[PDB]
Amino acid sequence: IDWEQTFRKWSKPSSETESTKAENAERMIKAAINSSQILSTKDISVFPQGSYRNNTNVREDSDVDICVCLNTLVLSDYSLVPGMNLAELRTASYTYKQFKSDLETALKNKFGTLGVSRGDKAFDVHANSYRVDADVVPAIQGRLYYDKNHNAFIRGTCIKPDSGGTIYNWPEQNYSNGVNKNKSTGNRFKLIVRAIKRLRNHLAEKGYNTAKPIPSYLMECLVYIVPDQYFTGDSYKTNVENCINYLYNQIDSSDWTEINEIKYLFGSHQMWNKTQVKEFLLTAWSYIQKNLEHHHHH
Amino acid sequence: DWEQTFRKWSKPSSETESTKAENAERMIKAAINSSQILSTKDISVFPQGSYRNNTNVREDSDVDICVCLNTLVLSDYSLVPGMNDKLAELRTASYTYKQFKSDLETALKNKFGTLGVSRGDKAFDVHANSYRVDADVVPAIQGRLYYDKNHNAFIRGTCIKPDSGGTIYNWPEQNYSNGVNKNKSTGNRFKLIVRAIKRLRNHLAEKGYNTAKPIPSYLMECLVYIVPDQYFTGDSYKTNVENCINYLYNQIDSSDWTEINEIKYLFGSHQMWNKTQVKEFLLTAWSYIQKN
Ligand SMILES: O=c1ccn([C@@H]2O[C@H](COP(=O)(O)NP(=O)(O)OP(=O)(O)O)[C@@H](O)[C@H]2O)c(=O)[nH]1
Ligand SMILES: O=c1ccn([C@@H]2O[C@H](COP(=O)(O)NP(=O)(O)OP(=O)(O)O)[C@@H](O)[C@H]2O)c(=O)[nH]1
Ligand SMILES: O=c1ccn([C@@H]2O[C@H](COP(=O)(O)NP(=O)(O)OP(=O)(O)O)[C@@H](O)[C@H]2O)c(=O)[nH]1
Ligand SMILES: O=c1ccn([C@@H]2O[C@H](COP(=O)(O)NP(=O)(O)OP(=O)(O)O)[C@@H](O)[C@H]2O)c(=O)[nH]1
Ligand SMILES: [Mg+2]
Ligand SMILES: [Mg+2]
Ligand SMILES: [Mg+2]
Ligand SMILES: [Mg+2]
Ligand SMILES: [Mg+2]
Incomplete structure (x- = not known):
């Protein structure tokens, strides 16, 4: 086995159309959001993440990872700052659960029921009519505080799986x-x-x-x-x-x-x-x- | 000790029930999406039965998956005297339940092999180890029960037409x-x-x-x-x-x-x-x- 030649061959992208697949997934998911009368009024960022975004994808059948992040819902990790970790009595208008359900409805309306499956963390989307294969994750704004100052936090995304728990992600970083x-x-x-x-x-x-x-x-x-x-x-x-x-x-x-x-x-x-x-x-x-x-x- | 016996018998069939149900759903959805006939139709593929409702107790229970063609409708007018298809705006369809069920059979056999699919009177029995699918896959169409003469005054569920004849209404979402x-x-x-x-x-x-x-x-x-x-x-x-x-x-x-x-x-x-x-x-x- 010529490992030099094999590793050089294996260093290639999965294809030359990775940017095309990622942008098409992003644009169709944005269109799904914009057609939803509920979600089109919300402060939502739709962006690619994962190996297509990072140019580290090697499998052509890999789904494009798209993050749909509701920016006005915040979950913060205070565990690094002593004394930083009450509850309000009024309920927040929009909940993560309602957000994920409305996203499911938007995806189904855009791509059809056959093309959308709800997973524990993300939606698996396979829509032949638009040729979209994507893992579409509902996220909210995530914060990591490193001091007691109001502005002393790092910003990322946060996922609340159906089965419980909290996941912090840092796709931009x-x-x-x-x-x-x-x-x-x-x-x-x-x-x-x-x-x-x-x-x-x-x-x-x-x-x-x-x-x-x-x-x-x-x-x-x-x-x-x-x-x-x-x-x-x-x-x-x-x-x-x-x-x-x-x-x-x-x-x-x-x-x-x-x-x-x-x-x-x-x-x-x-x-x-x-x-x-x-x-x-x-x-x-x-x-x-x-x-x-x-x-x-x- | 009936108290401890009933407490033990109250557990789920396993800790992987959600995984099994999701895998059954996704593999059947993949079979439909691979079908050149069915992949273009308005079809919902969803779990029902004891896995969906968290009442399953046998680990070898098949996952109940409903494949519902939403654009074919059968309406129950038995509660509203004088209610018919014209008063409900239902156009007659070219595509039949019979051919839909045959096309579903073809999609399942193409994905899981002829050996892995058995046609029953009501549903298909699917057992494919390569995809880890053990499922009862029922072909359904949209069913409606009307409660008034208004054209939107109906409750929506599913409808099954067994090979041997007759009509069955189901209400899995309710x-x-x-x-x-x-x-x-x-x-x-x-x-x-x-x-x-x-x-x-x-x-x-x-x-x-x-x-x-x-x-x-x-x-x-x-x-x-x-x-x-x-x-x-x-x-x-x-x-x-x-x-x-x-x-x-x-x-x-x-x-x-x-x-x-x-x-x-x-x-x-x-x-x-x-x-x-x-x-x-x-x-x-x-x-x-x-x-x-
Ligand atoms: O355990 C995990 C899994 C996933 N993730 C985050 O979710 C992203 C996508 O999740 P992914 O499973 O698609 N992994 P990816 O890097 O895209 O490689 P691959 O699809 O196999 O080519 C990852 O790139 C991570 O940023 C985690 O942070 N932790
Ligand atoms: O930390 C995480 C983990 C997961 N994810 C995202 O959530 C998706 C589902 O993550 P998953 O672990 O539920 N299933 P997976 O095998 O990765 O893909 P799938 O076959 O579609 O069920 C992943 O593909 C990622 O895109 C994150 O974004 N961040
Ligand atoms: O007579 C019937 C039988 C079945 N069904 C519907 O079909 C579904 C699945 O049919 P099922 O025979 O698998 N019964 P299930 O509730 O799943 O319990 P289990 O023995 O653990 O598998 C049932 O849950 C009912 O909703 C009926 O509506 N009527
Ligand atoms: O009302 C019904 C009845 C049946 N079904 C579905 O059709 C499948 C087959 O229904 P079945 O009555 O032909 N055989 P079943 O009693 O379920 O199993 P077995 O006793 O071993 O022969 C069931 O397991 C359900 O998934 C419905 O979905 N709704
Ligand atoms: Mg990925
Ligand atoms: Mg992924
Ligand atoms: Mg996927
Ligand atoms: Mg069952
Ligand atoms: Mg069954």
């Missing part, structure tokens, strides 16, 4: 930090993200169980953590090896964040843990070598 | 909403007791008590829904079950009960069950709970 790192590495960062995502997909489809619990976004975060110096040179294989090496040797003592540099990459709030990452890294390290004499599951 | 309302008013005790009594019926049926055999799950869900909320209070599930059995046995003869949708009458020539069967089962269950 994700995108912006990824672009910044791509500039600092002369575009090598996202090339290597895509190569490693395709490596993980390859391993998962070949039945390597260590690859299955390692999703795309986790790998984007992990590769983002690798210092820029390891992306230099003219060997993509050396870049991949540097990433695996750095991550494996630094993960145990680390307290890494996601690519947004706001949310912790590991903890009880995440679906993954350091052991799974380490097992995957060992699998990947062995798999790219030319001839292994021995195997490491001990 | 079923779901009324069940949710009663579950809220009783602090979730309603559906816990529904599940406990369904497991009691299944236990009795598998032990050879013949009176349990003609008592299906949906009938018991309706019957428990009828019981007033006061009998779901307290901290004894056993007392809740006994209250339901007592109330139902003592009120059934003079009653004119409806299904949980509060639209269809629970007993009559349109149903597969009758009051005598319910009473025989209630006596069986009451005696079985006492003699143990």
Whole structure:
């Protein structure tokens, strides 16, 4: 296996029409909102997120992630500021539940009932008439306070799944930090993200169980953590090896964040843990070598 | 220990019920969207039955999915004398329920394979391990029950036309909403007791008590829904079950009960069950709970 040529091939985008798919999904979801007499009067931002936005998508059948964010509903994380975490007696006019229901109705009115399915977190939209395949998430404004000052917060999005709980997302920070790192590495960062995502997909489809619990976004975060110096040179294989090496040797003592540099990459709030990452890294390290004499599951 | 037994029997069939229902819905929706005929039609694909209503107790229960063609309408005018299709603005359709059901069969077989799809008199039985689908997929069209001569004075549900003939009206949205309302008013005790009594019926049926055999799950869900909320209070599930059995046995003869949708009458020539069967089962269950 020529891993240099394979990684160069695997560094490509899923296609050259990714911007087209993302913009078409965005515009059709905006049209769905604008046709809703309830939602068209609300303060709502519709924007792409996920791997299509970040140019890290590698699968052509990947749904476009569209965030529909109601800006006038706010949920804040006060856990970092001592003494910052009452209730008002008047109810807020619009609730997250009513917002998600009205979004469901708007999507169904625009794309038809066959094209919309309500999920726990987002709507799965598959509308052949408009050729839209999208994961459309209802979000509200999310805040992380870092001081007791009224303006001392970072702004992102917040999701309230049907099954309970609160999820904080930072899509703008994700995108912006990824672009910044791509500039600092002369575009090598996202090339290597895509190569490693395709490596993980390859391993998962070949039945390597260590690859299955390692999703795309986790790998984007992990590769983002690798210092820029390891992306230099003219060997993509050396870049991949540097990433695996750095991550494996630094993960145990680390307290890494996601690519947004706001949310912790590991903890009880995440679906993954350091052991799974380490097992995957060992699998990947062995798999790219030319001839292994021995195997490491001990 | 009937208290702990009923508490255990009140649990859902598993912790993955919502996942199973959603997967069934999405895979059937994908089959429809792959159909060159059906993908352009106004069709709703949605779960109904015990998975939708959170009253399922058997892990091997198939997910009930309704595939409803909304642009075909069958109207019930039996409550409004002098109401017809012209007074309801319904144009005659070229497309028939028969061909719709055949096209649904084709869509399902194309996605899940011929081996994974069986046509029944009412619905398709779908069992495809590759997609992890175990479902009863019923073809329905829009059904209407008119309550006045106004052209918008109707209640909307679904309508099924079995291969062997006849017409069945269903009201899955009303079923779901009324069940949710009663579950809220009783602090979730309603559906816990529904599940406990369904497991009691299944236990009795598998032990050879013949009176349990003609008592299906949906009938018991309706019957428990009828019981007033006061009998779901307290901290004894056993007392809740006994209250339901007592109330139902003592009120059934003079009653004119409806299904949980509060639209269809629970007993009559349109149903597969009758009051005598319910009473025989209630006596069986009451005696079985006492003699143990
Ligand atoms: O666990 C998660 C999953 C998803 N997300 C957020 O939701 C976005 C989209 O969720 P996603 O599952 O589509 N992941 P994505 O990065 O688009 O990769 P892929 O579709 O496989 O090519 C991610 O990019 C994250 O920003 C999380 O923050 N945490
Ligand atoms: O943190 C998150 C997690 C999830 N999401 C968004 O919510 C969607 C659903 O997230 P999901 O975990 O419910 N299911 P998934 O397998 O990712 O996709 P699907 O097959 O459509 O059910 C994801 O695809 C993301 O777009 C976020 O936006 N942020
Ligand atoms: O006689 C019937 C049978 C079924 N149905 C409708 O069809 C739905 C599903 O039919 P079902 O036979 O699966 N009964 P279900 O309530 O799901 O309980 P379970 O044994 O756990 O599967 C039922 O919930 C009813 O709403 C009727 O309306 N009348
Ligand atoms: O009123 C009805 C009746 C039936 N159905 C749907 O049609 C499916 C088949 O209905 P069925 O009566 O042909 N067979 P069923 O009693 O459900 O199972 P079994 O005893 O093992 O033969 C049911 O499981 C429901 O999903 C309805 O949706 N509404
Ligand atoms: Mg994505
Ligand atoms: Mg997605
Ligand atoms: Mg999706
Ligand atoms: Mg059922
Ligand atoms: Mg069934």
